[PDB]
Amino acid sequence: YVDVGPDSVKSACIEVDIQQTFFDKTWPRPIDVSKADGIIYPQGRTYSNITITYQGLFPYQGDHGDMYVYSAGHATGTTPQKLFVANYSQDVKQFANGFVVRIGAAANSTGTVIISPSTSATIRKIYPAFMLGSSVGNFSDGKMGRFFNHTLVLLPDGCGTLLRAFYCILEPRSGNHCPAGNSYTSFATYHTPATDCSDGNYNRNASLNSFKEYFNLRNCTFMYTYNITEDEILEWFGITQTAQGVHLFSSRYVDLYGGNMFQFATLPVYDTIKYYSIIPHSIRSIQSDRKAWAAFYVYKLQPLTFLLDFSVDGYIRRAIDCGFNDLSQLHCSYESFDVESGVYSVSSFEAKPSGSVVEQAEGVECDFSPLLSGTPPQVYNFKRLVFTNCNYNLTKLLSLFSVNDFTCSQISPAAIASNCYSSLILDYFSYPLSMKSDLSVSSAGPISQFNYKQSFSNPTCLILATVPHNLTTITKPLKYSYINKCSRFLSDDRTEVPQLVNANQYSPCVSIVPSTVWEDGDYYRKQLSPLEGGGWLVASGSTVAMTEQLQMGFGITVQYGTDTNSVCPKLEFANDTKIASQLGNCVEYSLYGVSGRGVFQNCTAVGVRQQRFVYDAYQNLVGYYSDDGNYYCLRACVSVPVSVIYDKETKTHATLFGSVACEHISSTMSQYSRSTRSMLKRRDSTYGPLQTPVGCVLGLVNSSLFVEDCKLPLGQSLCALP
Amino acid sequence: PLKYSYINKCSRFLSDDRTEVPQLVNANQYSPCVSIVPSTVWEDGDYYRKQLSPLEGGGWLVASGSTVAMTEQLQMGFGITVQYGTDTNSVCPKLEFA
């Protein structure tokens, strides 16, 4: 492994107080794509001043990003105090094909200290620290953001002029305020300007030393270092991951002024990254020497395509996010940054999805009603009902009795009610509660030995319960009974062999024992034929007095199909929204396995009735006969055409929604055809939609002027002045 | 190795303990089950499970594997792939230019 050097000796750490409410600030930074903000230069190639389309990962143009700020820790007088930091350590983020950042953007300006904002200190660039890896979870104190196995460490050391990278296993420390300790709050790292960054000795290990105070490096597999120099100019940086491993990008090495990112470095690690977090950092400087720091930003990559305006000097200077709005699509369609004026078609609205409507056969029902009448059998004589291909609700069945024992082996008692199975089998018998200690598949008692047993090849279960006073069709035995002996005497009339009951089967002795045992300790015998090898069947039984309500026991077993699980607990919209119909909009549907999306309406009937599905010559479903006896018809769904008026001379635009009319038009769209409508809103935030003979429009204005040729006619007598 | 071995299962059980969904390996990447599976499979048909946190979306990770007897001389396999770049094409056969 890599020689990173020794773990700091003390296990102790500086206390970290979370002050996150102090850090709420509003400084958003949308991407200025016309300035090529955030653009990663294409790999390995260059071009002349020709514009080209390109596809690759890019930040979304409209995203204002995630913003964060590093700050000084607490200090008073001339000395340090415990750290005050933002809660960014708790902010686990999902990795999503990499990210890019902006660094130092507030340089040559002023702001406030934030943690002690009254100071109004000027603000400057700090290089960020980050951690990446394949898994996250709770710290032993339940704290957010612990990472597992090896993780990436992107850590600057001391001044921004030194950068280091690592792939290594962190180990928790048991000192006060540290990760294995229970005095831990949150992880942080720090820099101390009193000795760090001396101008005669920059402290090359400074950030690492404070990093080591919270974690012991272990099993390290990689380390790297880089040389950086100070520059107040804004920088871009970012990370991607490929099957060739992780790569690092920066604008600093190649394009200080144009800002185009280039692959600054690469890393040997190709282990997939699933998560990302920002490591908090703080300044340990004297209270009057504290300095405010610049806002920093993060944006997420997406598989976008763009126009790129290469400069003759090969830097990309301008770009168009094709999918941001319809105008951007128009430019991409013509592969240019200057479309000639005209009216142009753009893609239609998708309309919108709505909640589903489904109709399928229901009510299969599950045989169970035999349990509710007559006298139940003695436990050795239990009755069985086998169920396949049908619908049930065991918890409804069990609410007909008061349950005094609900247990199973190899399934939870709750899960067997809620799981589909290929079959469901129920055994039932009368059974006194006085014998309940002897009812288990594992019991030492005579009930498990000779009366009832259940297989361990399936997840069976048992139940004890009693009958409510309103179940008057149930009747009870004179005494509860069971077999307490069952053996066969061997034919030599001295040797004897016990006959424990077979799983899921009647004992052989049930054939000699009477349907109930008349008295406690009654016994019977049967001579066996020479075909049996001779001998005598021998059996005996015992009883419990009858009670004011019948007491009962049950056995349940199931078989789970691999793909044959027919028996399920279907409900006919119990505890549900009753989605058998809507009338109506455009919500996806399924009708006996036929599916599509559309609007239903209560129309008239057409034949042939009871063929269910009416179709046209193109096989579009026309309509459907519901099991409520009503014909409904289907128009599927519709879309809204859109077009745009483009005035290149003023570089302005307005829109037309066509035939749809302004009743369905609103200031924003819930449907939707493009990621934004905001380019219309630049002037149309102040105006209502206007209705015209061709269709509803936005930003058109009723001037009622008469002009012979507007160069942008909308057809008809509509005309459209610049 | 003592035995040659491999993973023959890697799926996540649904939190309701009935439904289960397979996790097929990504091209050119380790399967996610490697975090719980032992460096070699100690016995044919060994399997392991991990409860998953609500942060993980719930359920149980489930994985299993199989083994093959060792041989007198080691047997090996290789996968080889190449990448064409544009200005990064620095890997070549030794030059014949002399």
Side-chain angles (χ1 to χ4, degrees):
Chain A
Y1 291 116
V2 174
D3 186 3
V4 297
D7 186 32
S8 176
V9 173
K10 67 183 180 183
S11 65
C13 312
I14 301 300
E15 182 176 351
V16 179
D17 187 351
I18 303 301
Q19 296 299 344
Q20 68 183 290
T21 62
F22 285 70
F23 297 85
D24 185 350
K25 297 292 182 186
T26 302
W27 299 104
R29 179 67 66 189
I31 299 299
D32 186 339
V33 74
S34 72
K35 293 179 180 176
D37 286 352
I39 300 300
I40 298 171
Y41 189 81
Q43 183 180 346
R45 297 185 179 187
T46 192
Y47 300 89
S48 74
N49 65 359
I50 61 171
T51 62
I52 62 171
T53 62
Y54 187 70
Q55 182 178 354
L57 294 175
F58 296 103
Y60 175 68
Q61 186 278 318
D63 190 353
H64 64 290
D66 293 350
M67 183 278 281
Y68 64 98
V69 180
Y70 291 117
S71 69
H74 195 216
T76 64
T78 60
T79 66
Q81 302 294 354
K82 67 180 181 180
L83 292 172
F84 288 168
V85 300
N87 66 325
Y88 292 128
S89 67
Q90 296 177 326
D91 294 340
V92 174
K93 298 185 182 183
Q94 173 66 53
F95 189 76
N97 300 320
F99 62 87
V100 298
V101 301
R102 296 171 75 88
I103 301 172
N108 299 331
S109 75
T110 185
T112 65
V113 171
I114 295 170
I115 194 64
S116 298
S118 66
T119 298
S120 300
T122 62
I123 55 182
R124 295 292 185 274
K125 178 174 60 168
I126 297 294
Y127 289 81
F130 305 107
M131 184 178 294
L132 303 97
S134 67
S135 178
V136 298
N138 293 330
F139 281 98
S140 66
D141 293 345
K143 302 291 184 180
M144 300 300 291
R146 186 176 179 180
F147 284 79
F148 293 100
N149 299 329
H150 293 262
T151 64
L152 291 174
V153 179
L154 303 178
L155 178 63
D157 286 271
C159 284
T161 62
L162 180 65
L163 174 66
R164 295 182 183 165
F166 304 94
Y167 191 49
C168 182
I169 298 172
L170 300 179
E171 176 182 0
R173 297 283 76 182
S174 65
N176 293 330
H177 309 301
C178 312
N182 66 346
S183 60
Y184 179 69
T185 57
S186 178
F187 175 66
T189 62
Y190 62 81
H191 176 281
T192 303
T195 61
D196 293 344
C197 291
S198 173
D199 289 334
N201 184 1
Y202 294 87
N203 185 358
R204 290 179 179 176
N205 295 306
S207 299
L208 183 60
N209 288 338
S210 66
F211 185 90
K212 288 190 293 187
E213 290 177 351
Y214 293 80
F215 296 97
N216 182 356
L217 296 172
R218 297 292 302 276
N219 300 314
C220 295
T221 61
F222 298 105
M223 66 80 67
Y224 296 97
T225 186
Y226 303 97
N227 294 319
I228 300 171
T229 65
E230 296 293 332
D231 189 339
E232 73 273 18
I233 295 169
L234 199 159
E235 300 185 10
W236 289 256
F237 178 82
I239 188 167
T240 67
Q241 182 174 42
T242 68
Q244 295 179 60
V246 174
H247 308 287
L248 301 176
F249 298 82
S250 181
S251 67
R252 182 178 60 253
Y253 187 67
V254 176
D255 187 12
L256 181 60
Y257 295 102
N260 288 278
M261 296 170 64
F262 292 82
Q263 184 176 301
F264 179 76
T266 189
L267 296 174
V269 178
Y270 54 84
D271 292 345
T272 301
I273 300 169
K274 300 297 186 180
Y275 300 98
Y276 160 68
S277 179
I278 294 81
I279 297 170
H281 187 80
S282 181
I283 304 301
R284 306 289 289 157
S285 69
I286 292 171
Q287 182 182 33
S288 67
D289 293 334
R290 293 180 294 162
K291 182 182 289 185
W293 305 110
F296 303 113
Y297 303 92
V298 182
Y299 305 88
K300 301 296 183 181
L301 297 179
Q302 297 181 342
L304 299 177
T305 182
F306 288 72
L307 296 179
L308 299 174
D309 184 351
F310 287 78
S311 172
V312 71
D313 70 16
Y315 290 121
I316 299 168
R317 299 296 182 176
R318 305 188 293 172
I320 301 296
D321 184 344
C322 292
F324 178 69
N325 63 32
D326 285 306
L327 181 58
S328 67
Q329 181 61 54
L330 181 60
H331 284 287
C332 290
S333 297
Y334 286 79
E335 300 183 353
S336 177
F337 288 74
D338 185 355
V339 175
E340 184 176 1
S341 296
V343 178
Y344 300 95
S345 174
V346 299
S347 177
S348 66
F349 284 94
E350 65 184 340
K352 62 183 180 181
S354 181
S356 67
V357 174
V358 178
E359 185 178 88
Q360 64 182 21
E362 288 294 344
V364 175
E365 204 35 28
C366 251
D367 243 312
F368 274 129
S369 69
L371 276 58
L372 299 178
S373 67
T375 299
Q378 298 296 9
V379 63
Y380 55 86
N381 198 41
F382 61 84
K383 290 174 182 182
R384 175 173 291 163
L385 301 173
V386 178
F387 298 97
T388 63
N389 196 31
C390 55
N391 300 328
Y392 73 100
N393 184 351
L394 183 60
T395 64
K396 184 66 176 178
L397 180 63
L398 293 176
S399 69
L400 298 175
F401 304 95
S402 175
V403 177
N404 291 298
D405 187 351
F406 191 29
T407 187
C408 308
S409 173
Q410 302 181 51
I411 189 70
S412 68
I416 197 169
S418 67
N419 291 336
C420 187
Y421 295 102
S422 67
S423 67
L424 175 62
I425 299 172
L426 181 148
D427 293 341
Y428 66 94
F429 49 88
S430 64
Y431 188 89
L433 293 177
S434 69
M435 290 298 294
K436 69 185 181 180
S437 68
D438 295 337
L439 180 62
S440 175
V441 298
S442 66
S443 178
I447 298 298
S448 69
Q449 291 174 346
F450 302 117
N451 294 262
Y452 183 52
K453 179 176 179 177
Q454 300 182 318
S455 177
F456 296 92
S457 65
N458 290 77
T460 82
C461 318
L462 309 147
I463 302 173
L464 296 175
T466 66
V467 176
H469 62 288
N470 291 316
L471 278 71
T472 62
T473 59
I474 296 173
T475 63
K476 65 181 183 293
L478 181 61
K479 297 182 181 181
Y480 294 97
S481 301
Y482 64 95
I483 296 171
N484 66 3
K485 183 175 180 178
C486 179
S487 65
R488 293 181 180 196
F489 294 97
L490 192 65
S491 67
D492 68 6
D493 296 324
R494 291 181 292 171
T495 301
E496 184 177 350
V497 179
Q499 298 291 308
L500 294 174
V501 67
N502 293 341
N504 297 328
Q505 187 179 1
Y506 290 152
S507 175
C509 292
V510 172
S511 66
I512 194 62
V513 175
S515 66
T516 190
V517 178
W518 293 339
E519 290 294 347
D520 189 87
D522 285 344
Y523 67 93
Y524 302 94
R525 65 182 181 184
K526 183 177 179 180
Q527 187 175 1
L528 302 177
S529 68
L531 293 174
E532 296 293 319
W536 291 76
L537 185 65
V538 178
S540 69
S542 170
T543 66
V544 177
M546 63 183 181
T547 60
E548 298 83 357
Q549 298 289 331
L550 182 66
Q551 300 181 339
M552 297 185 69
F554 305 91
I556 299 173
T557 69
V558 294
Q559 174 68 60
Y560 184 65
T562 299
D563 61 0
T564 60
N565 59 334
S566 44
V567 189
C568 313
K570 300 295 184 183
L571 300 173
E572 298 178 6
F573 300 120
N575 298 324
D576 207 345
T577 59
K578 300 181 181 180
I579 64 168
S581 67
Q582 295 291 330
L583 332 130
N585 286 324
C586 172
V587 307
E588 200 180 342
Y589 65 83
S590 178
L591 300 172
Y592 292 93
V594 176
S595 65
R597 180 182 292 175
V599 65
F600 288 92
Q601 66 185 104
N602 176 34
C603 55
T604 296
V606 299
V608 177
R609 291 180 295 169
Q610 301 185 4
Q611 298 301 307
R612 289 184 183 276
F613 299 94
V614 180
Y615 295 90
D616 67 10
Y618 304 95
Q619 299 296 301
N620 296 303
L621 186 66
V622 174
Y624 179 73
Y625 285 90
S626 174
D627 290 334
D628 67 3
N630 292 309
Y631 187 52
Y632 297 99
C633 293
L634 179 65
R635 306 294 287 167
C637 297
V638 297
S639 62
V640 178
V642 181
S643 68
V644 61
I645 296 86
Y646 184 61
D647 181 340
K648 181 270 191 182
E649 291 77 5
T650 62
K651 299 184 181 179
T652 64
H653 67 277
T655 62
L656 172 65
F657 295 87
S659 295
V660 70
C662 297
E663 184 62 25
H664 302 292
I665 301 301
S666 62
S667 67
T668 189
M669 296 291 177
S670 65
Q671 292 171 65
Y672 60 87
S673 67
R674 298 289 177 190
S675 66
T676 192
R677 294 288 75 177
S678 63
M679 73 179 184
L680 274 55
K681 292 181 181 181
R682 290 176 180 175
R683 300 296 298 176
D684 294 334
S685 67
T686 61
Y687 299 100
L690 301 177
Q691 185 68 58
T692 72
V694 174
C696 185
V697 298
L698 290 174
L700 265 292
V701 175
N702 183 346
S703 71
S704 296
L705 294 174
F706 293 79
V707 177
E708 296 82 1
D709 185 352
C710 295
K711 307 298 180 186
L712 296 167
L714 304 177
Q716 298 293 316
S717 62
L718 275 64
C719 188
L721 294 173
Chain B
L2 180 60
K3 296 184 180 181
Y4 296 91
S5 68
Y6 64 96
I7 297 169
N8 65 7
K9 185 175 176 67
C10 179
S11 64
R12 182 179 66 186
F13 296 97
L14 188 66
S15 67
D16 293 339
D17 297 324
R18 182 178 62 80
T19 298
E20 185 177 76
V21 178
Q23 302 294 308
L24 295 174
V25 68
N26 293 342
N28 299 328
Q29 297 181 6
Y30 298 177
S31 66
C33 290
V34 171
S35 67
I36 64 168
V37 174
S39 66
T40 189
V41 179
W42 293 118
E43 181 176 358
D44 188 88
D46 283 347
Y47 67 92
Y48 299 93
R49 299 184 182 177
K50 180 180 182 293
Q51 185 176 8
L52 303 176
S53 70
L55 293 173
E56 292 172 309
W60 289 75
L61 188 63
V62 181
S64 70
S66 173
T67 67
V68 178
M70 62 183 177
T71 60
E72 180 180 354
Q73 301 292 319
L74 179 67
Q75 305 298 320
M76 298 181 71
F78 303 86
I80 300 173
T81 187
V82 297
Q83 176 71 59
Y84 176 74
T86 300
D87 68 358
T88 58
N89 292 307
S90 63
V91 180
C92 311
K94 294 177 180 182
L95 294 179
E96 300 300 324
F97 182 66

